[PDB]
Amino acid sequence: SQSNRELVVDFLSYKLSQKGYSWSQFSMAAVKQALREAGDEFELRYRRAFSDLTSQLHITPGTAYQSFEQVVNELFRDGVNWGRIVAFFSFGGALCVESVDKEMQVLVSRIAAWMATYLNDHLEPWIQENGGWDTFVELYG
């Protein structure tokens, strides 16, 4: 539970750092590094294939959550796998970068809580029944 929240903050600080933002201005290392490279490749693959992740998402401080929950619930509607989790982390980082790009810096701490809550209550079960985060490192990295 604490490692899950520490995982979310690291990935969000990483994606925020790529756009020139700092984490503290708003609010295992192999698992961090592996998830970082997977999120970079995924977001790069998404931009090439389709579009920016959150630019078409007309988000506002009031529309942030009930559009976040619509995406994650649909992403994991018919199962969970490692690639869908990398998709889950990348969508949150793009949401946090989008919130700062639109002068909504009060949302990054909210998104970090929404991700960590879904990580524990809905994603960690599949992690323990599938080797844990250790399996994620031997597959990515």
Binding site: L53, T54, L57, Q70, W82, G83, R84, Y140
Partner: peptide, 24 residues
């Protein structure tokens, strides 16, 4: 809304592709 529906869809396919690619 309508873009989140498309965004949710696109996240699936790319996520399932990353899964099957890494799995092999």
């Amino acid at each position: 809304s309508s873009a989140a529906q498309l965004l949710a869809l696109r996240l699936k396919l790319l996520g399932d592709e990353l899964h099957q690619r890494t799995m092999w």
